[PDB]
Amino acid sequence: VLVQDLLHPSPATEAKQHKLKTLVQQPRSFFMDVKCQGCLNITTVFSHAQTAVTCDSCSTVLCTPTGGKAKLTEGCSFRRK
């Protein structure tokens, strides 16, 4: 295809692209609100967290780091901000 709108890529194919290969690079990661099951305390956690974040109230691990996105422990619910 010789003629193409490079300035307006289809947003579907733009999202399958690598994160550095869009027109303007933009991270695909985000920040989350973690509700532990034990208590009710908003704790802001990065989606790709490298730390075993613990909430202030109880010294319980909220998430465990993995190769990519952190894995939330059971009973912890997140909502993306």
Partner 1 sequence: GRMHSSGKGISSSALPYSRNAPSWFKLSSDDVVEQIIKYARKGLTPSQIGVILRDAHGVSQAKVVTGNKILRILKSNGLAPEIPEDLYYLIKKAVSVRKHLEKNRKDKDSKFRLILIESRIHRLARYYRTVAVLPPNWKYESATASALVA
Partner 2 sequence: TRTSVLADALNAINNAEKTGKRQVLIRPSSKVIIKFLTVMQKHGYIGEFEYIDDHRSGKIVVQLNGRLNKCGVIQPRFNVKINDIERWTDNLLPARQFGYVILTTSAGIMDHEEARRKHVSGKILGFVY
**Chain residues in the site for partner 2 (CB under 8 A):** 2-4, 6-7, 23-25
Nearer to partner 2, 4 or 59 (CB): 4
24 in contact with partner 1 (CB under 8 A): yes
Minimum distance, C-beta of residue 1 to partner 1, in the bound complex (Å): 26
Question: Looking at this protein, which amino acid is placed at residue 27?
Answer: P
Stretch that binds partner 1, among 9-17, 18-26, 71-79 (CB under 8 A): 18-26
3-state class percentages of the chain: helix first, strand second, coil last, to nearest 5:
5, 25, 70
Beta-carbon contacts of 58 under 8 Å, excluding residues fewer than 6 positions away, are: 36, 38, 39
45 in contact with Zn ion (CB under 5 A): no
Q: Rounded to 10 degrees, what is the CA torsion of 42, 48, 50, 56?
A: 0
Residues that bind partner 1 (CB under 8 A): 19-20, 24-27, 31, 43-46, 49-51, 53, 81
